[PDB]
Amino acid sequence: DEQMLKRRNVSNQGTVNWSVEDIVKGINSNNLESQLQATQAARKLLSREKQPPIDNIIRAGLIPKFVSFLGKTDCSPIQFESAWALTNIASGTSEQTKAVVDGGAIPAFISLLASPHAHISEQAVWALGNIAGAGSAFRDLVIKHGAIDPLLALLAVPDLSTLACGYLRNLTWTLSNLCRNKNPAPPLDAVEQILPTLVRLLHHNDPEVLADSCWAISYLTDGPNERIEMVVKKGVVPQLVKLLGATELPIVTPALRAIGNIVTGTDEQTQKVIDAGALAVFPSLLTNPKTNIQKEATWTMSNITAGRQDQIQQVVNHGLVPFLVGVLSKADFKTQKAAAWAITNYTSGGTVEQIVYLVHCGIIEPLMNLLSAKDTKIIQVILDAISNIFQAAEKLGETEKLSIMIEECGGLDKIEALQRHENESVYKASLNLIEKYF
Numbered sequence: 001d002e003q004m005l006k007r008r009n010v011s012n013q014g015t016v017n018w019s020v021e022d023i024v025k026g027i028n029s030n031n032l033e034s035q036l037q038a039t040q041a042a043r044k045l046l047s048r049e050k051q052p053p054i055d056n057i058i059r060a061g062l063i064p065k066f067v068s069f070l071g072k073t074d075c076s077p078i079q080f081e082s083a084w085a086l087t088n089i090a091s092g093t094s095e096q097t098k099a100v101v102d103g104g105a106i107p108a109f110i111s112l113l114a115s116p117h118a119h120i121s122e123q124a125v126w127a128l129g130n131i132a133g134a135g136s137a138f139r140d141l142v143i144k145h146g147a148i149d150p151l152l153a154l155l156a157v158p159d160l161s162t163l164a165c166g167y168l169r170n171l172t173w174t175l176s177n178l179c180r181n182k183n184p185a186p187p188l189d190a191v192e193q194i195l196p197t198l199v200r201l202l203h204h205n206d207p208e209v210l211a212d213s214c215w216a217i218s219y220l221t222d223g224p225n226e227r228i229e230m231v232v233k234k235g236v237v238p239q240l241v242k243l244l245g246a247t248e249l250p251i252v253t254p255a256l257r258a259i260g261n262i263v264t265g266t267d268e269q270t271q272k273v274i275d276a277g278a279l280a281v282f283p284s285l286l287t288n289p290k291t292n293i294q295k296e297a298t299w300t301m302s303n304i305t306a307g308r309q310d311q312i313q314q315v316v317n318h319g320l321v322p323f324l325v326g327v328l329s330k331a332d333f334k335t336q337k338a339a340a341w342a343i344t345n346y347t348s349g350g351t352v353e354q355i356v357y358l359v360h361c362g363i364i365e366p367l368m369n370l371l372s373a374k375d376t377k378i379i380q381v382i383l384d385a386i387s388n389i390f391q392a393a394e395k396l397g398e399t400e401k402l403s404i405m406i407e408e409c410g411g412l413d414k415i416e417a418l419q420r421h422e423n424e425s426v427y428k429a430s431l432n433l434i435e436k437y438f
Contacts, residue, residue, distance in 0.1 A: 001292075002253065003176065003215040005133045008091040009084055009126065010049065015041040020056045027065050032075055039069060039081040046088035054092045063089065063103040070108040070124075076117050083112060083123035090130040097134035106131060106145050113150035121154065122167050129174030136181045143178065143190050151175060152197050160204050172201050172209045176216035185223050191230060195220075199234050207248050214243055214254035221261035228265040232272055237262065241276040249290060256285065256293060260300040263307075270307050279304075279318040286323040295335040298327050302342035305349070312350045321361045329366040336370060340381045343367065347388035355392035359402070363389075368411035376423050383429040386415075390437055403437050412438060 018026075018041035026038020042062060046052045057063075062085075069075075069082035086109075090100040105127070112124035128147055132139040154171055157163060175194060179186060194216075201213040217236060221228050240262075243255040259278055263270040285297030301324065305312055315321065324346075328339040343363060347355055367382050386406070393402045406412055415438075418430040 001257065003173075003212065005177075005180075006091045006097075006130045007126070007173070008047075008052070008088050009123070010047050010088075012040070015044055018042075018045070020045070020053065020060050023057075024060050024062070027062065032072075032078070035065075035069070036075065036078045036081065039066065039078055039085060042066075043081045043085045043088075046085050052088060054089055054096050057085075057089065058096065058099045063099055063105075067100075067103040067105050067108055070105070070112060076115075076120060079112065079115070080117070080120045080123060083109070083120060083127060087123055087127040087130060090127055090134070094134055097131055097138065100127075101131060101134075101138060101141070106142055106147075110145055110147050110150060113147075113154065118164065118167060122170050125151065125154070125167075125170045125174050129170070129177045132174065132177040133180070136184060139178060139181060139186065140184075143187065148178065148190055148193055151178075152194070155197050155201075160200065160209075165206060168204075169206065169208045169212070172212040172216075175201075176212045176219065179216040179219040181219070182223065185227060186220075188230075191220055191227075195230065195234055199236055199239075202236060202239050202243070207246075207251060210243060210246070211248070211250040211254060214240070214251060214258055218254045218258035218261060221258050221265075225265045225269065228262055228269050231258075232262060232265075232269050237272045238276040241273065241278045241281065244278060244281050244285070249293070252288075252293060253290075256296050256300065260296050260303070263300055263303045267308055267311070270304060270311060274304070274311060274314050279314055279320060282318065282320050283323055286320070286327055291332045291335065294327065294331060295338060298324075298331075298335050298338040298342060302338055302345055305342045306345035307349070309349065309351055309354070312346055312354055315346075316354060316357060321358060321363075325361050325363055325366060328363070328370065333373070333375075336373075337375070337378050337381075340367075340370060340378050340385070344381050344385040344388070347385045347392075352392045352395055355389055356396070359389060359405075364402075364405055364411070365409040368406065368409055368414060371411070371414040371418065376421075376426065379418065379421070379423075380425055380429070383415075383418075383426070383433070386433060387429060390433065399437055407438075 015037055023038045023042045026034045066082040066086050069078045072078050086100050086105055090097045109124045109127050113121050115121045128142055132142045198213055198216050201209055217231060221231050240255050240258050243251050244259060246252055259273055263273055285293055288294045304315060324339050324342055327335055370382055393399045415430050415433055419427045421427050
């Protein structure tokens with residue numbers, strides 16, 4: 001969604017605004033201090049607000065020199081300037097990150113993780129996050145070069161609060177990029193190795209560390225059940241439900257994404273989210289002023305209403321059915337679509353009593369109103385739900401009350417209209433209901 005994939009560091013009048021040919025001249029001199037000044041000039045060009053000249057720097061053949069400067073243990077300032085220059089190259093397009101990787105940067109950044117200068121190992125952390133951020137293959141190449149052990153060692157402190165706050169936020173972000181992307185997902189053993197440090201970051205009290213830790217957890221739960229399970233067995237679901245309640249939207253967004261992923265897994269995994277209390281935050285989520293939260297919260301509901309009857313029952317007992325009626329009545333169209341699915345899944349799996357309750361909450365009229373939509377998938381969905389609700393009505397002998405109700409509010413006028421609908425599944429279902437109940 002919205003965590004940044006790559007980040008440029010954009011944070012001595014002698015090195016302001018040099019031309020690239022001057023930078024090349026300094027870097028080719030045989031003089032370490034001249035090389036240092038010219039590298040800092042390159043860093044300033046790459047750090048400016050607007051259009052840093054990344055392609056010109058690459059075209060000038062500078063990356064291999066910067067990369068040999070990362071090895072200059074005797075001259076920490078040039079390690080730091082070149083680490084920052086290369087971080088900012090690796091922040092651009094794929095092909096710009098690839099040029100940094102192709103110069104041999106990855107093992108050179110990984111040696112700088114051990115640097116005694118915090119500003120330098122922090123830039124090395126940042127660079128490796130931009131490299132992993134370019135894609136699965138570079139992510140796994142960073143891993144194969146052994147980045148994870150020295151990354152985690154930087155967080156191996158009794159209390160995360162003693163680390164500088166910018167430094168901890170860089171580390172958390174780079175670790176979330178090692179959890180990100182999917183074809184393929186990160187190696188199972190790398191995920192196992194990273195998870196305990198993640199679970200600890202998710203209890204930290206910095207809002208940016210919290211947001212990025214939750215994004216990492218959301219990546220790790222976005223996959224098959226086996227991937228969800230390794231996160232859920234670490235016991236993080238209660239902490240995630242707590243963060244779902246936070247005031248800051250950059251924290252709610254990824255906590256909700258992770259919870260929404262966890263409930264696409266097994267009924268047992270979906271239960272952990274119910275047991276942890278998640279359903280009590282849904283009245284707010286489903287009325288959230290941020291349309292993406294309301295949309296995701298409703299998709300999350302639809303995967304819970306696709307659960308067992310005792311799970312549909314918890315949705316009922318938390319008072320969430322009137323909130324689904326609310327979202328079906330008035331919401332962004334994409335959220336109404338998600339609510340339509342949530343209703344169809346509810347009616348497909350719920351008992352007679354649970355389905356009757358839905359009609360008592362006023363599901364019928366906003367469902368019919370949506371039969372007007374120019375979206376032929378939601379029409380299938382609704383017709384499906386109507387058919388399901390009729391079926392429960394038959395089992396009580398009340399089919400006629402429902403028909404009157406559907407007709408009462410303009411419904412029949414649209415199930416009829418939809419027999420001449422240019423999709424096949426549509427008019428089938430239509431015709432069926434019309435002749436089966438009207």
